[PDB]
Every structure is written in C-alpha cells, then in structure tokens.
C-alpha cells in the first residue's frame, strides 16, 4: 500500500534474482534488466523514508536543468556538488576536453532540454533561440492538447553523446493527462538502486509537480521505468538493514505561491512538509 | 506460464481500469499510462497465437528499416502496404509537404537508425557516411563491451519531428547482455493494443534475434514498456472475443544460415516453425 514498498520490493528482487554483472568501473553489481514502479503523486510526495534523500540537491539540480546550464559551478554555487567531479580539470582532460574551462560538462540535460539539436560550443555560449526547447514544448502541449500521445522530453542525443562529460542516465520522459491529472514516465537506462534511484524518483516527481502547477493540473502518477537496475556489491549489507525498516508516511510538497512559467520557479517557492526519514553507502 | 498471458492481462487491465480518453483520431479510447511485460525469447518466439499476426509484414518492415529506407514505395513493392497511406499525396499534402514526392516519409526510423543527426533532404538522397549509424554502433558495442549500460538506439529526434510523416511510436530501445544472453527493452510511447502491439512485440523480438545472431549471443528477454497504452472503443468487442481464446505454445524462429552483418539478412534466411494461431480477428483502423 505505501508506495515506497515498491522500491524496497525492487531492491529485494535484485538481491534475490539479479545476476552478477561486471560494470564500467569494476566494482561489480547485481543486476536485473527491465523494471517498473508507479508512485502516486496525489496528496503526497515520494521522497523515500527508509533512508534520507538529499532534497536540497534534488531541487537545486532541477532548477539548474531548467535554466539550461551546463556549468557544474553554477550548481555547486548553490551548495550542491554532485556534478563537480564530472566537470573537474583532470576529468575533462581525460576525455580530451583540454580546451574547456573547468565545470563545462558539455551538452548535458540543461542543453538538450532547452536547445536540442543546436550546435554546442561551450557552457558560456549564447544559445538563445537555437535548437528545440523541449521543456517549453511539453508545457505548451499539455495546455493546448492534453490528450496528445507525443509529449516527450528527450535528453538522449546520439549526435551529442561524445561531447558530454557523461551520457545521461535519464534517457527521456513522457507526460500524460487524464481526469485533470498529469502523469510522467521516466525511461532510466541505468539505475544505482542504493545511491541514485531515490534521488532520481524525487527529481521527476518534482518536475511533474512543477509542470502540473503551471498548467493548472493536479499531479497523477510518476512511472519509473528502468533498464539496468543494479545494486553495487558494496551496498548489499547496508540495503539489507534498510530493507528491515518500515516506511514512514510520505511527506507533502507545497508550492507556496502562484507561479506562471517554469522559468520563474525559485527554491523558496517549495516546502517539504512532514519528512521523517529513518536515520543513517559509498559511491 | 505462457508469455502471451501478459499481453492478454494488459488488455484485460485496460478494459477494467482504463480511463476513457479522447484522441487525435476522434474514435476515443480506454487508456492506461505506464505498463511493462517481459517476453522470453529463450527457445521460443513471441508471435501471438490468440490472433494471427502479419509476420511477412514484420520481417519486410524490419528489413526495410535496416537498409535505411524512408520510401514507402520500397516496402510496398514487397507486398507490405502498412506505410503506404503515410506516404500518399493526400496525406503528405495535409501535412504541408506538397513539394515532396509520393512515398517520401521524411526522416523516420530507417534514417534515424542509420544516419541520426544528418541533414534530411529527400528519400532518394545519398546519406552514406552522414550522421550516427546507431544500429551498427549497438552491434559494435555488444561485441566489444557487452556490459555497457548505454546500448541504445533512439528514433525520437526532436529536431526532425516536424519533417516526419508520423512521429515514431517506438521512441527508443536499449540492449543488455548478461550470461551470454542479449535482451532488448522498447520504450513504446503509444500502443494500439488491438492492432499495433502484437506486431510491435514481434518486430523487436525479431530485431533481438537478428542482433544476437550477428554478435554470437543467445536471445534473452524482450521487455516491452508502454506509455499510453490504449484500446480504441471499436476494438473492444473484437478483443473480448480474443480474450476467450486460450494461447497455444509460441512458435520457434529459425535462422537458416550464418549471417555476418545486419545488412546481409534477407527474407529467405528466416523460418517461423510451428505457428498455429487462432484465426485473424479484423479490427477497424483508427
Ligand atoms: O542511478 C543513477 N542516476 C543518475 N542520475 O543522474 C546518474 C547515474 N546513476 C548511476 C547508474 C550507474 O550506476 C552509474 C552510471 O554509469 P553508467 O550506467 O555506466 O553510465 O550511475
Ligand atoms: O501501436 C502502434 N504501433 C506503431 N508501430 O509502428 C505505430 C502506431 N501505433 C498506434 C498508437 C496509436 O494508436 C497510433 C499513433 O497515434 P499517436 O500515438 O496519436 O501518434 O497508432
């Protein structure tokens, strides 16, 4: 009944039925290919309670995508340092991006969402009016033709892949309207169940709350679809302890004023209410 | 537990729990957003048995994608007419492409799979060496780095959307290797459960058979993920008839020689063995 039970049941499934599968680093995982969960967004927000999620992170990252930034420093400046390693001098240099300034992640989410198909130069270039503004397109469609079955925002851009500091885990999302309610489905190609997935659910849930607010709809479901769902072998023992915790009721997300456009949202517009995660995993 | 039961349980779910949702066509639907089924490809091929699926069409269509064609006439010449209406004068005209030659679907699957990001001109243009050959990239990666979590072919191209005769229902697919087995997940954004979906499952299961053959792996699973899964209101009675039929075991798919490149497959190289479906059920197209 509690929606977090689906996440825990996925983790239980990978622990019990997953296959050992080597991976790009070399730490090894247990893996299952193809999973799906549905998190209701109706009068609650799916911010996992069996372990704390970095909400400040979720929110600032999402605001950073929306402004179309591809500078890790513009995020880091908000106290959210999750993308900093990927834009470091040594990391960029290792990919052959010696000409880039530190921070320049290349044409990642912000760019694809706002400027798909534009020619990326650097993180400081002016791309005003260039490419497809997928995010505004989705919002426009939801308002004018909510029954449309093509309401997609796609970060996966095969042309641009070699220029990105890393390829996106969240390949595309799709939006859906029925009965005054906005749903979102994420196709996530690769999910670290222990460390990444709870954050990723909160992210796409928050986007859906944001879009539903500006289009005058209510949040429906967040449908989480995974490709390689995995648990790193060093996360097994912590997840078994986590798996013994009963979820606390999900918190509520409140939007504190009437916001007209997606660009106008600010950190202060949001309040998480009644979040009571169980107390205290390496990447 | 017969794999076709998942498809039938999806249809039953939509019939029972779907919402009525108007659509672009005006016929209306019952719809659910977000579904997933897994079809084993291990010593069986998921060609549905509760009605007859147009296998010839599945095979010719996929071959046609593979060679990069965006010319409906080139598929029609094989006796497979499923794209002809999309390339017709009247339809191209309605979309505003009156300068376009009849048959010219614009930058659809074949172009995206073989030339992603190239500048489309017309269906007769020479695109050799232009854009990203995603199909070949996926094959290459499967061979050189089977654990890669980025093995994706994406037909959804927001830049090209406005030039396409129709936007792709199959937005992307991802491949996955473990234990000597090749799996594929399709993200299908919109599924006509009556007419489209059984054909679509066969398409991607066949694609997976083809790639596993080329990369020397065994087919694993086909995971079918749907966005707007819908039943047109006029398919309801035909599907209620179908839901009464008990599935028969799935057929086997045989590949009849060693093929070394995906471009070298021909219709003659495939044999469906033991396909014993219940009769065709006819359903009016939206
Ligand atoms: O769960 C994840 N969520 C992300 N959100 O931005 C990013 C990454 N991941 C995980 C999935 C894999 O563990 C790893 C990415 O490695 P890849 O799948 O090899 O590209 O990080
Ligand atoms: O199920 C489908 N499979 C296709 N495979 O190529 C193509 C189309 N369809 C269905 C889904 C919708 O009923 C219709 C396309 O309409 P749209 O989702 O409104 O773009 O055809």
Swiss-Prot record, chain A:
GO terms for biological process: dTMP biosynthetic process; dTTP biosynthetic process; methylation; tetrahydrofolate interconversion. It comes from the Eukaryota. PROSITE patterns: THYMIDYLATE_SYNTHASE (PS00091). The modification Phosphoserine is found at residue 88. It catalyses: dUMP + (6R)-5,10-methylene-5,6,7,8-tetrahydrofolate = 7,8-dihydrofolate + dTMP. It is found in: Nucleus; Cytoplasm; Mitochondrion; Mitochondrion matrix. Gene3D superfamilies: Thymidylate synthase/dCMP hydroxymethylase domain. There is a cross-link at residue 266 (Glycyl lysine isopeptide (Lys-Gly) (interchain with G-Cter in SUMO2)). Pathway: Pyrimidine metabolism; dTTP biosynthesis. (6R)-5,10-methylene-5,6,7,8-tetrahydrofolate binds at residue 192. One of its GO terms (cellular component) is mitochondrial matrix. Keywords: Cytoplasm, Isopeptide bond, Membrane, Methyltransferase, Mitochondrion, Mitochondrion inner membrane, Nucleotide biosynthesis, Nucleus, Phosphoprotein, Transferase, Ubl conjugation. It holds the Pfam family Thymidylat_synt. Its EC number is 2.1.1.45. GO terms for molecular function: mRNA regulatory element binding translation repressor activity; sequence-specific mRNA binding; thymidylate synthase activity. Its main location: nucleus. The active site is at 169 (nucleophile). DUMP binds at residues 24, 149-150, 169-170, 189-192, 200, 230-232. Homodimer. Belongs to the thymidylate synthase family. Catalyzes the reductive methylation of 2'-deoxyuridine 5'-monophosphate (dUMP) to thymidine 5'-monophosphate (dTMP), using the cosubstrate, 5,10- methylenetetrahydrofolate (CH2H4folate) as a 1-carbon donor and reductant and contributes to the de novo mitochondrial thymidylate biosynthesis pathway. HAMAP family: Thymidy_synth_bact. This is Thymidylate synthase. The gene is Tyms.
Swiss-Prot record, chain B:
The active site is at 169 (nucleophile). Its EC number is 2.1.1.45. GO terms for molecular function: mRNA regulatory element binding translation repressor activity; sequence-specific mRNA binding; thymidylate synthase activity. One of its GO terms (biological process) is dTMP biosynthetic process. It is found in: Nucleus; Cytoplasm; Mitochondrion; Mitochondrion matrix. Pathway: Pyrimidine metabolism; dTTP biosynthesis. The modification Phosphoserine is found at residue 88. Gene3D superfamilies: Thymidylate synthase/dCMP hydroxymethylase domain. Its main location: nucleus. CDD domains: TS_Pyrimidine_HMase. Keywords: Cytoplasm, Isopeptide bond, Membrane, Methyltransferase, Mitochondrion, Mitochondrion inner membrane, Nucleotide biosynthesis, Nucleus, Phosphoprotein, Transferase, Ubl conjugation. It comes from the Eukaryota. It catalyses: dUMP + (6R)-5,10-methylene-5,6,7,8-tetrahydrofolate = 7,8-dihydrofolate + dTMP. GO terms for cellular component: cytoplasm; mitochondrial inner membrane; mitochondrial matrix; mitochondrion; nucleus. DUMP binds at residues 24, 149-150, 169-170, 189-192, 200, 230-232. There is a cross-link at residues 266, 282 (Glycyl lysine isopeptide (Lys-Gly) (interchain with G-Cter in SUMO2)). (6R)-5,10-methylene-5,6,7,8-tetrahydrofolate binds at residues 192, 286. Homodimer. Belongs to the thymidylate synthase family. PANTHER family: THYMIDYLATE SYNTHASE (PTHR11548:SF2), THYMIDYLATE SYNTHASE 1 (PTHR11548). Catalyzes the reductive methylation of 2'-deoxyuridine 5'-monophosphate (dUMP) to thymidine 5'-monophosphate (dTMP), using the cosubstrate, 5,10- methylenetetrahydrofolate (CH2H4folate) as a 1-carbon donor and reductant and contributes to the de novo mitochondrial thymidylate biosynthesis pathway. This is Thymidylate synthase. The lineage of its organism: Eukaryota, Metazoa, Chordata, Craniata, Vertebrata.
